[PDB]
């Protein structure tokens, strides 16, 4: 195959090496990939090599049905919140993500918590039912080890209509130990009440050279800690009955990856066997279980967190500073987010539809309040050019007009208005209608002709556009694809189609 | 590792043929060019080939100095309006371009005429002075050669005083059936012919050209009627009107030849490579007078003034140059019925007229420029050019559509016109221009970001106004945007103009704004 090397001058400033066969010139992908910011690689199949080029690796969610409030939440069946490195851990006390997106301290960010919930809710609807192995009920329907100094016994508990295992072990002892031996499933679950302080510990055989790591759930409020091969999580007093549910995969990886930075250090470590459970102090223990997944317990932990942490104004105040960029006043702690409000509402509505417990709906109804107040009056409302109401992901001065957060704020209002009924849904209905009018009018401002912009800070600050990376662009499409199944407006379908095409390299026509 | 074919799947839908050497994959430029919409070619040097790649195709004008109203007009020293295929010819009557931009009929489009003038004005300031050869003054300077008239049977000629304009003049009588009276010229280098002319009766002044089409003689007849342009075989006819009063006729024989032989019924002049190589002789028919016969390399100021005079005579009572063709800007935009005004026309005309005023101090030019701001005060629906963006920023429309269109380049030309006028008119009379400019520049600074894609510019805001895809600016309009902003940046020290120019320039060599 006869070819000639040829110098290839690039915009009169750099020379790269190409190849030539008569008139056809061939450019190295090393250059193409960097210069155009595109993707490809050689893929080896049985008796066929093929280079495979992509404009992006991000992919649009394959919607299977029109959206409905009790169904999967957009594309979140495929999200995995807990592996994100901005999640420092799943809180021992609250059973939800503690995030570190903006500083290393670790704070409850409501969005991450709602997305934890929504993603698990969605996986509950799409994944295969979990295998559930029961190790201890305490009934009449063993392999505990009680060393000297310790006692164990089955006892009635009238308070909760069951039999229960009581244990007494001092902290100087080896504790009382239940052999488990699960090779496949790593979500451990048990009912727990402590009389005195103590610990429930889980020993794991890992893939790090066959070593045993132990995860201690201790009855204090201690921040996550990691020494050698011991991981410590504070689960609070548990001096009343509650179900503890812990993903040993996540809990192991977050412990070994413990960092003083805003990102968990990557680790490959996996548990390969849940060896045994170790009880110390004085207390009670029931329903000891290992499951493939515990999606509804994750969903409810998020739901209950939202109910308990909503403030008197119906907001989830965000208790860290956020500096959105030069030009934007810094957001002082206690700011609200339209994305938080909406995602929370979408979570609470789902909790209500499952349980019929009006505590969930009552929280969702209150959560519209911040939508009514401008950013400078402790709300999330912004007005674009004295004409279009908007609900801000970041209620900055000047206004920021972030697209994706806004669309989640609307999906929440849709969820609520479809669920509250005509009377009580009035406020949600009205905020939604106004918001969808704004969105239809303003969508074109986010369209570059070969991508989307993330926000309107170019217009509001007089600077370069803050273009959306491909994964945010895909989110825009997923959002509009969703809206397009609950609102029959042609504009949503047109924009979805064009925005999809951008992902495969299509451009708007030039003149 | 040896050069080998490899299949290359593109976005999981089409397979192209590339090459591979070990790990390095090489993609055909045939694909790269079309998929990313870029440019390149193999260029031949002495025993050495090189492929040359460009992200874009236009270039930014190298601005030399801060802009001022009596200087060159932006980049227009490098425009050549008359060779554009949308210029059907230079009118014999009006001495300015007749254009065919949207319909084949041919109409006087103000923008093309203003640009004709501004470009010649700018060339006057940058080109070398023209060589000027004088063939007849009719005085007593004409004792030695050139003599050179052939006055055949039936015809007469004489030098005669003309009290009307304090000079001697050549009088001619030739019937139109004769071969006419003929002055040998023989210029090989210069092709702009110029002569003062008054006709008593009908007639023609004709110019014979040796051309590069196998040495053939073509004759261009400037005839005393309003007939526009005709072409049979080797004769070209232009109507120059009665000329029964003294006037300077000035004609580019290159253009006049090429427009004639390229005469078409379509929107575009047929391309030709025919050039004149010799202006052989001038032929006078009918009864009249003839003075100051000249051939020059260029006649920039005559072109400029022809444009200026056309603008003064054709301005309407509303101070506009009405555009007399229907214009449908695109689906969603109401059709513009004839008589619509353009902010680009108004501004460019003003920039022309101000320059004419600064040169001549004839207040007719300034007063026409002052009237030309009136359409800027009136909304599109009231037969002006003003649009308002979201109840907040005044704008001056290139196309005063419903809904508003907000075309960027037209707007910036409308502002450079107002700048020229307000800098020139003085405190009292410049008030209106001052105010329209200030409001315009405030709008521009606020709205510039809406035209920035992060790797190009948008031409207009039809995407926002109609709910459709952006009308992205082709690269030559992108460089126009930069040339405009580069100019404004020398008359307004706002940092925003400097930052945008720099970023917009970087887009030309494939830089992008950062993604998040
Ligand atoms: C380990 O796991 C098991 C589940 O497998 C748990 O055992 C269950 O415990 C719950 C208590 O939380 C039991 O639910 C309660 O049942 C009580 C009586 O049920 C029987 O009798 C009634 C007549 O009253 C019959 O109708 C019924 O069919 C049963 O035969 C109820 O009194 C409780 O009602 C509560 O809710 C209502 C509102 O709905 C309140 O108004 C009441 O005041 C009251 O609070 C409740 O329904 C459940 O039956 C147990 N199941 C079994 C099979 O034992 C263990 O609790 C768990 N371990 C720990 C430590 O939590
Ligand atoms: C061929 O080319 C030659 C020049 O190359 C031309 O000859 C010149 O043409 C003009 C014709 O008008 C002569 O212009 C001079 O105008 C003076 C006043 O005119 C102005 O001011 C009055 C105000 O009352 C207005 O009415 C008028 O419209 C103008 O605004 C006259 O006064 C001149 O006459 C004498 O005065 C001047 C100084 O003021 C003396 O220096 C002169 O020598 C002269 O005696 C004169 O009319 C100009 O002088 C001509 N130049 C020469 C050298 O002859 C031809 O016109 C051109 N051929 C054709 C056919 O156009
Ligand atoms: C999505 O969430 C759904 C709702 O939470 C899940 O379906 C539910 O799955 C459970 C099965 O784990 C069913 O609960 C009961 O199961 C018992 C079996 O006895 C055991 O139960 C107790 C604990 O309560 C245990 O301690 C005992 O020792 C036993 O081992 C049945 O006998 C009951 O009748 C009852 O079925 C729910 O019924 C079931 N609900 C529904 C609506 O299906 C679903 O699996 C989740 N899916 C995913 C993919 O996560
Ligand atoms: C630009 O225009 C000016 C007209 O002012 C030209 O300068 C004149 O040239 C004529 C013809 O040779 C002379 O009669 C004058 O003496 C000149 N006037 C001045 C003020 O210099 C100039 O030649 C033109 N230049 C170009 C490149 O077109
Ligand atoms: C309870 O707390 C004390 C310190 O406050 C600690 O020393 C002790 O070991 C704890 N008890 C158990 C059973 O872990
Ligand atoms: Ca029990
Ligand atoms: Ca004379
Ligand atoms: Cl995710
Ligand atoms: Cl041009």
Which residue has its alpha carbon closest to ligand 4 atom 22?
B129
DSSP letters along A91-156, please?
-TTTSSEEE-SSSTT-B--HHHHHHHHHHHHHHHHHSPPPPEEEEE--S----EE--TT-EEEEEE
**Pair of tokens at residue A61:** 């969610």
Helix axes A338-355, A295-309, angle to 10 degrees: 120
Whether B421 and B427 have beta carbons less than 8 Å apart is answered as: no
Buried b (16+ CB within 10 A) or exposed e, B90-101: bbbbbbbbbbbe
Q: Please give the full DSSP string across A328-356, using - where no structure is assigned.
A: SPPB-SSB--HHHHHHHHHHHHHHHHHH-
* A9 closest CB neighbour out of B53, B512, B514: B53
Q: How many CB pairs under 8 A join A and B?
A: 209
Q: Is B158 labelled as part of a ligand binding site?
A: no
Pairing between β-strand A271-291 and β-strand A162-169 as defined by DSSP bridges: antiparallel
Which ligand 1 atom is at minimum distance from the Cα of A193?
A: 60
- Report the separation in Å between the CA atom of A112 and the middle of ligand 8, taken as the mean of its atom positions: 10
Are A468 and B515 inside 8 Å of each other by CB?
yes
Report the nearest-CA residue for atom 44 of ligand 2: B166
**Location of structure tokens 């020139």:** B424
Report residue B472 CA to chain centroid gap: 24
- Ligand 1, residue A287: give the atom nearest the CA: 1
Query: Looking at the partner chain, which of B23, B53, B463 has a beta carbon nearest the beta carbon of A444?
Result: B463
- Determine the residue among A29, A53, A461, A497 to mutate to test chain B binding: the one whose Cβ has the most chain B Cβ atoms within 10 Å: A53
Q: B49 and A9: CB-CB below 8 Å?
A: no
- The 3-state secondary structure of B233-253, one letter per residue: CCEEEEECCCCCCCEEEEEEH
Scanning the structure block, which residue is given the tokens 């110019």?
B207
At A40, is the secondary structure helix, strand, or coil? Answer: strand
Which numbered ligand comes closest to the C-alpha of B80? 9
With CA atoms as reference, the chain A residue closest to B7 would be A50
Omega before A398 within 30 of 0, i.e. cis: yes
Contacts of B26 in chain A (CB under 8 A): 18-19, 26-29
What is the nearest CA distance from B490 to chain A, expressed in angstroms?
A: 19
Residues of A in contact with B3 (CB under 8 A): 1, 3, 19
Q: Under a CB-based contact definition with an 8 Å cutoff, are residues A338 and A431 in contact?
A: no
Name every protein residue with a CB atom under 6 angstroms from any ligand 5 atom.
Answer: A 171, 197-199, 280-281
The phi and psi torsions of B336 (rounded to 5 degrees) equal: -90, 115
Number of H helices, E strands in chain A: 11, 20
Q: Which among A10, A439, A509 is the top mutation candidate for probing chain B, defined by the most B β-carbons within 10 Å of its own β-carbon?
A: A10
**Are the C-beta atoms of B376 and B388 separated by less than 8 Å?**
no
User: What's the gap in Å between the CA of A73 and the closest CA on chain B?
Assistant: 25
Ligand 2 pocket: which of B164, B167, B196 to mutate (most atoms <8 Å of CB)?
Answer: B167
Going through B212-332 in order, the beta strands assigned E by DSSP cover 217-223, 229-232, 235-239, 247-252, 276-296
Query: Do the Cβ atoms of A50 and B8 come within 8 Å?
Result: yes
Q: Cα distance from B473 to chain A (closest Cα, Å)?
A: 6
Determine the distance from the C-alpha atom of residue B90 to the mean position of all C-alpha atoms in its chain, rounded to a whole number. Answer: 11
Short-list B423, B446, B431, B299, CA closest to B350: B423
A32: nearest Cα among B510, B12, B2: B510
Diameter of chain A by CA atoms? 90
Tokens of A31: 């250059």
Helix axes B300-314, B343-360, angle to 10 degrees: 120
Contacts of A281 (CB under 8 A, 6+ apart): A169, A171, A194, A195, A196, A197, A198, A199, A219
Residue at token pair 């994750």: A298
Q: How far is CA B5 from the centre of its chain?
A: 51
Instruction: Tell me the pairing of strands A271-291 and A187-206.
Output: antiparallel
A134 lines ligand 3 (CB under 6 A): yes
Let me know how long chain A is. 511
> Helix axis angle, B475-488 relative to B408-425, nearest 10°?
30
CA angle at residue A476 from A475 to A481, to 5 degrees? 95
Atom of ligand 3 nearest to the CA of A293: 50
**Other CB atoms within 10 Å distance of the CB of residue B313:** 9
Which B residues 28-67 touch A at CB under 8 Å? 28-30, 32, 35-37, 40, 42, 49-55
* Separation of alpha carbons A490 and A434, rounded Å: 18
Tokens at B98, concatenated: 């007749």
In angstroms, the CA A209 to CA B343 distance is: 77
CA angle B446, B451, B453 (to 5 degrees): 130
In 3D space, the residue among B338, B339, B462 whose CA is nearest the CA of residue B408 turns out to be B462
Query: Which of B137, B163, B166 for mutating ligand 2's site (highest number of atoms within 8 Å of CB)?
Result: B166
Instruction: Determine whether the interchain pair A448/B453 forms a contact, defined as Cβ–Cβ distance below 8 Å.
Output: yes
Q: Which residues of A touch B458 (CB under 8 A)?
A: 449
Bridge partners of residue A206, in order along the sequence: A271
d(CA A54, CA A188): 41
The helix, strand and coil proportions of chain A, stated in percent and rounded to the nearest 5, come to 30, 30, 40
Q: Tokens in use for A383?
A: 């007005």
Instruction: Tell me how the structure was determined.
Output: X-ray
How remote is the CA of residue A211 from the centroid of ligand 5, in Å?
A: 27
Q: Tell whether B392 lies on the interface with A, counting CB pairs under 8 A.
A: yes
Q: CA–CA separation, A247 vs A291, rounded Å?
A: 9
Judged by CB atoms closer than 8 Å, whether chains meet at B32 and A32 is answered as yes
A319 contacts: CB under 8 Å, gap ≥ 6: A107, A108, A333, A334
Rounded Cα gap, residues B319 and B262, in angstroms: 35
Between helix B408-425 and helix B363-372 the angle, nearest 10°, is 140
State the ligand closest to the CA atom of B97: 9
Partner-chain contact B454 A465, CB within 8 Å: yes
Burial label for B400, CB within 10 Å (0-12, 13-18, 19+), is buried
Helix (H) or strand (E) holding A29: helix A29-36
Final resolution, Å = 2.5
Question: What are the Cα distances from residue B316, in Å, to B341, B348, B357, B407?
Answer: 11, 16, 19, 24
**Chain A interface, best mutation among B41, B57, B451, B469, by max A CB count within 10 A:** B469
Provide the chain B residues 398-417 that lie in CB contact (below 8 A) with chain A: none
Ligand nearest to the Cα of A81, by number = 8
Assign 3-state DSSP to chain B and report helix, strand, coil percentages, each to 5: 30, 30, 40
Is omega for the bond preceding B146 within 30 degrees of 0, making it cis? yes
Asked whether the beta carbons of A453 and A468 are under 8 A apart, the reply is yes
DSSP notation for A186-201: -EEEEEEEEEEEEEEE
CA atoms in the 13 A half-sphere facing the CB of A142: 17
CB burial readout A43-55, b (16+ within 10 A) else e? eeeeeeeebbbbb
Tell me if B50 sits within 8 A of A9, measured CB to CB: yes
CB contact, 8 Å: A465 with chain B?
yes
According to DSSP, residue B270 is labeled P
Q: Enter the tokens of residue B187.
A: 């210029």
Residues of A in contact with B52 (CB under 8 A): 8-9, 12
Instruction: Supply the angle between the helices A295-309 and A358-366 in degrees, to the nearest 10.
Output: 50
* Contact (Cβ atoms closer than 8 angstroms) between residue A388 and residue A401: no
In three-state form (DSSP H/G/I as H, E/B as E, the rest C), the secondary structure along A393-416 is: CCCCCCCCCCHHHHHHHHHHHHHH
Q: Residue B472, SS3?
A: strand
φ, ψ for residue B206, nearest 5 deg: -120, 145
Contacts 24+ apart (CB under 8 A), A152-158: A152/A176, A155/A284, A157/A284, A157/A286
Q: Are B178 and B286 in contact (CB under 8 A)?
A: no
Question: CB distance from A471 to chain B under 8 Å?
Answer: no
User: What's the rounded Cα separation, in Å, for the pair B348 and B112?
Assistant: 10
Beta bridge partners of A187: A247, A291
**β-strands B39-45, B48-54 pairing:** antiparallel
* Neighbouring C-alpha atoms within 13 Å toward the C-beta of A325: 17
Residue among A29, A5, A16, A22 nearest B52 (CA): A16
Q: Specify whether the CB–CB gap between B196 and B187 falls below 8 A.
A: no
Q: Which residues of B touch A508 (CB under 8 A)?
A: 469-472
Domain ranges of chain B: 55-129+298-516, 130-297
Contact (CB, 8 A) for B176 and B332: no
Q: Is B470 strand, coil or helix?
A: coil
Ligand number nearest to the C-alpha of A154? 6
* A374: β partners: A381
Closest CB to B6: pick one of A11, A49, A467.
A49
Residue closest to B240 by CA, chosen among B197, B281, B290: B197
User: How far apart are alpha carbons B65 and B71 in whole angstroms?
Assistant: 9
Contact call for B12 and A52, based on CB within 8 A? yes
Q: Is A238 exposed, middle or buried (0-12, 13-18, 19+ CB in 10 A)?
A: buried
Contact A449 B464 (CB under 8 A): no
Give the residue among B341, B343, B350 at the shortest CA–CA distance from B308.
B350
Pairing of strands A151-157, A162-169: antiparallel
Write the residue with the smallest CA distance to atom 45 of ligand 2.
Answer: B166
Looking from the CA of A329 toward its CB, the CA atoms found within 13 Å total 11
Q: Residue B51: which of B66, B60, B41 has the closest Cα? A: B41
A445 and B470 Cβ atoms separated by less than 8 Å: no
* A295 within ligand 3 shell (Cβ under 6 A): yes
| B35 among annotated binding-site residues | no
Whether the Cβ atoms of residue B300 and residue B250 lie closer than 8 Å to each other:
no
Q: Which of residues 290-329 of B touch A (CB under 8 A)?
A: none
Give the closest residue to B235 by CA, choosing from B250, B217, B253.
B217
- 3-state per-residue secondary structure call for B76-101: HHHCCCCCCCCEEEECCCCCCEEECC
Q: b/e map of B253-263 (b: 16 or more CB within 10 Å)?
A: bbbbbbbbbbe
């Amino acid at each position: 195959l006869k070819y000639e090397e040829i110098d290839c001058l690039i915009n009169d400033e750099h020379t790269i090496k190409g190849r030539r066969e008569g008139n056809e010139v061939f450019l190295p992908f090393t250059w193409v990939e960097k210069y155009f910011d595109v993707y490809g690689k050689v893929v080896q199949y049985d008796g066929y090599d093929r280079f495979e080029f992509s404009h992006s690796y991000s992919k649009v969610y394959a919607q299977r049905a029109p959206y409905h409030p009790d169904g999967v939440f957009m594309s979140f069946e495929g999200y995995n919140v807990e592996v994100r490195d901005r999640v420092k851990c799943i809180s021992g006390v609250e059973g939800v993500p503690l995030s570190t997106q903006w500083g290393p301290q670790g704070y409850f960010y409501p969005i991450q918590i709602a997305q934890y919930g929504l993603s698990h809710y969605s996986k509950n609807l799409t994944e295969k039912p979990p295998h559930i192995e029961v190790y201890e009920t305490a009934e009449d329907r063993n392999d505990w080890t009680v060393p000297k100094g310790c006692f164990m016994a089955n006892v009635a508990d009238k308070s909760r209509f069951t039999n229960v295992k009581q244990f007494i072990a001092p902290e100087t002892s080896e504790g009382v130990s239940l052999q488990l031996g699960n090779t496949k499933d790593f979500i451990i679950s048990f009912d727990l009440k402590f009389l005195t302080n103590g610990s429930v510990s889980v020993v794991l055989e890992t893939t790090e050279k066959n070593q045993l790591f132990t995860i201690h759930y201790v009855s204090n409020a201690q921040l996550i800690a990691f020494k050698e091969r011991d991981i410590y999580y504070g689960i609070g007093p548990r001096t009343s009955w509650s179900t503890v549910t812990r993903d040993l995969v996540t809990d192991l990886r977050k412990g070994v990856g413990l960092s003083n930075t805003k990102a968990v250090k990557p680790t490959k470590i996996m548990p390969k066997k849940v060896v045994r459970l170790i009880a110390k102090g004085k207390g009670f223990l029931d329903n000891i279980t290992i499951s493939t997944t515990a999606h509804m317990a994750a969903f409810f932990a998020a739901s209950d967190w939202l109910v308990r942490n909503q403030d008197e104004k119906g907001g989830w105040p965000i208790m860290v500073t956020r500096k959105l960029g030069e030009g934007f006043k810094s957001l002082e702690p206690g700011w609200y987010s339209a994305m938080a409000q909406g995602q929370a509402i979408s979570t609470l509505v789902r909790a209500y539809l499952l349980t019929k417990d009006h505590i969930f709906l009552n929280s969702a109804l209150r959560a519209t309040a911040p939508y009514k107040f401008l950013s400078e009056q402790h709300g999330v409302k912004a007005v674009f050019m004295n004409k279009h109401d908007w609900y801000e992901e970041y209620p900055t001065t000047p206004s920021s007009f972030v697209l994706n957060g806004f669309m989640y704020s609307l999906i929440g209002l849709y969820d609520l208005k479809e669920t509250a009924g005509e009377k009580l849904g009035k406020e949600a209905r009205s905020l939604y209608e106004r918001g969808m009018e704004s969105l239809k009018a303003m969508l074109p401002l986010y369209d570059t002709g070969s991508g989307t912009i993330y926000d309107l800070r170019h217009f509001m600050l007089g600077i370069a556009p803050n273009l959306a990376r491909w994964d945010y662009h895909t989110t825009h499409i997923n959002q509009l694809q969703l809206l397009s199944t609950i609102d029959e407006s042609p504009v949503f379908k047109e924009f979805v189609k064009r925005w999809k095409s951008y992902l495969k390299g299509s451009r708007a026509k030039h003149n």
